[PDB]
Design a protein around this ligand. Structure first.
Ligand code: HEM
Length: 289
């Protein structure tokens, strides 16, 4: 399939900065969500899951068509919990009805990363809502009870290499698992974007335990947890080298995450040669708002 980005009619940077601001102000306002984590991490997870359905082989799935809005995808077991992100964005969509669904879901992720003190993520508009029959079947998102070889093969479908996979996974510094969503038990959580995922992988004393859903996960006495696929990044020697790199260089992690996350959000989209350049949105803080 070819999906050509089409700018929402007459819109420019200032329009999208307004949408960014509305999302950011609501992120600040709705601070109580999920035991005071706020909506930042679930917005990042939503932007990833609406993108992570992409298949490079036939260009099905991906963020372009906004298909998460349709019941098949909305009800994917892999997406359990994401309804909260969708509900958060609903009033934003209603205030700015001109923005496409894929643009809104992906921008929500960019906004959340930046507002949580993450790197700037350049972002491009022009995703166009596609019909219900374009919604990808369930089962394209990854399982957590797997090893490094699984992770590496899985991400080849999204055209991501080892460095991109390790960078993207640093998002698991954010938020938590919820037993009722995924069968993984979380505890403490953070809503500030840092490279701490890599530091925790290397520095904590991990114990392989069974949780209350009878699934294995790696736990530390500090109350930290890792999925088996997280832990695989220190079991595989190629992933381990990159983990160490990011643990020792915050700026390099930020730069690599920004590139990979934009790429993830743009996979499947053809941008015309005279499309606008990617937008870099100012944070609320930078605007004095
Ligand atoms: C091997 C690949 C991955 C697997 C198996 C995986 C699995 C999971 C699972 C099981 C959860 C818990 C969901 C819940 O119980 O609420 C989760 C949460 C999350 N994921 Fe991943 N994930 C992967 C990659 C990624 C990527 C690439 C990103 C973004 C760059 C990401 C961002 C997040 C975030 C921010 C959360 C927390 C959401 C919240 O706190 O509500 N994940 N992931």
């Amino acid at each position: 399939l070819v999906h050509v980005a089409s700018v929402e009619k007459g819109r420019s940077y200032e329009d999208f900065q307004k949408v960014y601001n509305a999302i950011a102000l609501k992120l600040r306002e709705d601070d109580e969500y999920d035991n005071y984590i706020g909506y930042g991490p679930v917005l990042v997870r939503l932007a990833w899951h609406i993108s992570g359905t992409w298949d490079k082989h036939d260009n099905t799935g991906g963020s372009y068509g906004g298909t998460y809005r349709f019941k098949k995808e909305f009800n994917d077991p892999s997406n359990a919990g994401l309804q909260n992100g969708f509900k958060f964005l609903e009033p934003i969509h209603k205030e700015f009805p001109w923005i496409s669904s894929g643009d809104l879901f992906s921008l929500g992720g960019v906004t959340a990363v930046q507002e949580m003190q993450g790197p700037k993520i350049p972002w491009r508009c022009g995703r166009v809502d596609t019909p219900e029959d374009t919604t990808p079947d369930n089962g394209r998102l990854p399982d957590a009870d797997k090893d490094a070889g699984y992770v590496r093969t899985f991400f080849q479908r999204l055209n991501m290499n080892d460095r991109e996979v390790v960078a993207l996974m640093g998002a698991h510094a954010l938020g938590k698992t919820h037993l009722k969503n995924s069968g993984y038990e979380g505890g403490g959580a953070n809503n500030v974007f840092t490279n701490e995922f890599y530091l925790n992988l290397l520095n904590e004393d991990w114990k392989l335990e069974k949780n209350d859903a009878n699934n294995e996960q790696w736990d530390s006495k500090s109350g930290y947890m890792m999925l088996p696929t997280d832990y695989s990044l220190i079991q595989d020697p190629k992933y381990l080298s990159i983990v160490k790199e990011y643990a020792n260089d915050q700026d390099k992690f930020f730069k690599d995450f920004s590139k990979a996350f934009e790429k993830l959000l743009e996979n499947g989209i053809t941008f015309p040669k005279d499309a606008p350049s990617p937008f870099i949105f100012k944070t609320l803080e930078e605007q004095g708002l």
